[PDB]
Ligand SMILES: C[N+](C)(C)CCOP(=O)(O)O
């Protein structure tokens with residue numbers, strides 16, 4: 001809803017039935033709040049217009065923030081029934097199936113059955129073969145890419161000049177190399193990750209609101225081959241952040257909402273059997289050795305989540321159209337980065 | 347056989363995208379050779395050494411396809427990916443901006459002469475029919491045909507040649523008044539009914555594999571695919587009976603105008619296409635089946651004119667921007683020769 005009637009034309013030419021030759025004035029489009037990278041819109045036929053065929057009365061329009069890998073990835077997942085159906089695809093975005101559901105709330109990530117299912121969902125997604133680069137260059141390649149931008153950017157507002165200067169006073173480039181030493185010496189398999197498994201990217205499916213099999217993972221924009229440790233660590237960090245806050249800065253950070261060791265162990269107890277066929281056949285002692293090594297792994301890679309999304313947020317404070325306290329969020333990520341580095345002593 | 351000194355790019359792509367033995371392969375133990383047939387893209391076969399054994403799942407040989415010169419880069423990739431997921435094409439192993447790594451399928455391309463074999467011809471038709479009935483996440487408006495012709499023409503009227511013999515050849519082609527002849531062509535096709543379906547757009551013998559140890563065939567290379575008039579896909583395929591791209595001396599193609607399918611052979615093709623595209627078909631009355639076939643005969647032979655015009659222009663564009671060894675200017679004259687020839691046969 002912004003005088004961009006490209007959404008109407010996209011729907012008219014890409015969708016079958018009633019959508020073909022649907023008059024401009026009879027087109028219903030509204031924004032869907034939530035995402036911090038991409039725009040999302042609902043497109044619908046008027047309730048009175050109801051045609052016979054396979055075609056949907058309601059679709060989604062997603063526009064990319066600021067290419068091929070996300071396109072091809074969405075198609076493949078659509079083809080495997082692992083995501084929504086794909087209706088249209090263009091360089092600027094896509095038209096996808098609207099799925100009756102809602103996004104999870106932050107507080108729901110901690111619920112045992114939810115947590116268990118996300119774990120299993122993530123385990124099976126990690127076991128997929130994808131036509132992408134198998135080298136784990138995403139993690140530090142991305143952080144170097146943002147860091148270069150961060151070190152270039154300047155502001156005009158005195159409040160923001162001060163916020164950026166505090167952030168840079170951590171000597172971010174050295175800090176990045178300390179992280180690189182820590183992480184490159186932490187064993188964690190490269191698997192297809194995714195890199196953003198957040199409440200807002202997990203759908204509670206209506207009807208299936210009973211039984212495992214309640215959820216769907218969506219939004220594979222940041223996906224790539226990566227260290228598994230990152231994918232789980234990033235998820236754990238997401239217990240601390242709630243993006244539904246209504247007032248500025250449009251998020252809340254709660255460090256004491258990070259999962260306990262017992263909560264992490266319950267998650268990885270569902271991850272492992274689903275990721276490794278012969279896990280449940282190991283002895284209790286060998287299982288616990290694996291579990292303890294994994295807790296060290298993911299909590300170290302958790303630091304890369306703070307560092308990466310902290311850097312991302314600073315960059316977004318320049319280039320993003322979305323209203324969100326990006327600077328305040330970057331600082332929140334780095335607060336958590338140093339706090340957690342402290343407790344680990346590494 | 348042996349690729350150009352930058353076999354190195356091929357090596358680096360294989361090493362990075364392919365799992366198992368490929369990860370630990372040295373540049374000195376990398377096997378690769380060029381495959382010569384295509385006129386858009388370049389193609390290579392890459393292999394592990396025979397002495398090298400796999401660490402399980404991974405392919406021992408793959409195909410590297412590199413895009414040629416001629417938004418559509420997205421559609422091309424998504425299309426290959428979707429077909430691989432459906433088992434309507436080779437598996438996708440790697441995708442990157444300049445091309446892809448794909449399953450090497452044990453097989454060979456068809457020869458020009460094989461297109462007329464009744465069994466080969468029937469299957470091509472059944473195959474094309476089932477592709478035509480697919481739903482794809484692309485634009486459903488038939489803008490491809492004339493959008494593409496207006497595109498190649500805009501460039502054709504802009505290009506200028508350094509060499510003198512190719513200055514004469516272009517001048518001759520331009521003296522047909524192509525901007526005006528395109529509007530002639532547009533008018534004729536506008537009043538020709540033809541179902542909009544997902545079209546392959548380049549169904550030649552070189553994009554059809556005869557599968558080893560053999561339902562004998564597989565349609566491949568969906569680069570030009572889009573929503574388009576059904577008549578063009580079939581019309582284009584009929585034109586392909588006349589053209590042989592395996593000639594080994596200049597201009598590296600042979601045109602035989604006498605090899606266009608007869609009405610008998612055209613009828614045999616569409617008699618296989620139809621029952622595979624229309625659920626009702628074989629139940630229909632004899633009278634009604636003839637009407638549909640006879641209307642289809644007119645439909646496809648009018649759209650065959652778009653095949654000659656479209657590829658004639660394409661071939662001129664390729665004469666300034668393509669790096670493949672081919673007589674692009676000679677090819678363009680042959681297609682426009684065939685266009686007026688066909689325009690006469692139709693009395694249009
Ligand atoms: C929220 N985040 C900073 C972890 C990821 C980017 O936002 P989104 O694209 O997942 O909304």
Ligand SMILES: C[N+](C)(C)CCOP(=O)(O)O
Nearest residue numbers: 384385386387548550657
């Ligand atoms: C052969 N053609 C001229 C009809 C189309 C372009 O060549 P190719 O891309 O199918 O090899």
